[PDB]
């Protein structure tokens, strides 16, 4: 489990941490989810997201 393997399973950003663990993170307007890997919107219109029905 390292950031160089599948991004540490982080959806957006990964940082290597202590004891062979990783810390995931997200860009502005998102919150790191309870699963510790995913990025969830934390504002009404977060960056880079398509929200109109396609």
């Amino acid at each position: 489990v390292t950031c160089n393997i599948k991004n540490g399973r982080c959806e957006q950003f990964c940082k290597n941490s202590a004891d062979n663990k990783v810390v995931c993170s997200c860009t502005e307007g998102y919150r790191l989810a309870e699963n510790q890997k995913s990025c969830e919107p934390a504002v009404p219109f977060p960056c880079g997201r398509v929200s109109v029905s396609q």
Binding site: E11, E28, C47, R49, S51, V52, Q54
Partner: protein, 232 residues
């Protein structure tokens, strides 16, 4: 964009169009409610339109704003080379109202912006010409372009390509950015979230076999973008 497809409304909600003496002379991307990032060679009185889809139809998602400040990158010098350090920021007169049609593009740090460019596939969009020396698009066009290796990119043109630029496109031609798309976004989708990886800059002949589109590497400028456009 040559060889692209019509976007659906709200498919590229960070895209803006720059209008001047000619409409759709360049593109740009929304950094936040008050700031647009574009190419420095694009930027006279400029009107920015966010929420645009069909440039010949007055729809209901468009937000038009005036530009109050132009910040070309401090290393940009058009007297030396119109296309080196080809990036600029535009401050809008009044903030955009963010919604499903008017949404910023994400901008990662330098390291991740470079990682995302290394994925090798980005989307470009714009209202530029739909053929080399052809008409501009009415409906926003988009196209997925693959990253081209550096040596191939250098062998394709007589002009010097520095390490702050990259090439993208197809060996067979037929699909490329074109005039009027300059300044718009090259974005990489990361698990459903798009990140800005390049600025559409220039080329010699749109979609010509053996030629490629040239783009500004955004990773080199993210710190400058974040500092200049910070709202808090």
């Amino acid at each position: 964009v040559v060889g692209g497809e019509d976007a659906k409304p709200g498919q590229f909600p960070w895209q803006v169009v720059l209008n001047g003496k000619v409409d759709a002379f360049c593109g740009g991307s929304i950094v936040n409610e008050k700031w647009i990032v574009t190419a420095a060679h694009c930027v006279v009185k400029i009107t920015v339109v966010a929420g645009e889809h069909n440039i010949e139809e007055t729809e209901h998602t468009e937000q038009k704003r005036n530009v109050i400040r132009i910040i070309p990158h401090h290393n940009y010098n058009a007297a030396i080379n119109k296309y080196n350090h080809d990036i600029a920021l535009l401050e809008l007169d009044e903030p955009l109202v963010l919604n499903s049609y008017v949404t910023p593009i994400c901008i990662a740090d330098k390291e991740y912006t470079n990682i995302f460019l290394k994925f090798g596939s980005g989307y470009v969009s714009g209202w530029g010409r739909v053929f080399h020396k052809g008409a501009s698009a009415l409906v926003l066009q988009y196209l997925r372009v693959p990253l081209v290796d550096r040596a191939t990119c250098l062998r394709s043109t007589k002009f010097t390509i520095y390490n702050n630029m990259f090439c993208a496109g197809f060996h067979e031609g037929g699909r490329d950015s074109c005039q009027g798309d300059s300044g718009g976004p090259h974005v990489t989708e990361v698990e459903g979230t798009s990140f800005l990886t390049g600025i559409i800059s220039w080329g010699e002949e749109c979609a010509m076999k053996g030629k490629y589109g040239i783009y500004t590497k955004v990773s080199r400028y993210v710190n400058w973008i974040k500092e200049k456009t910070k709202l808090t």
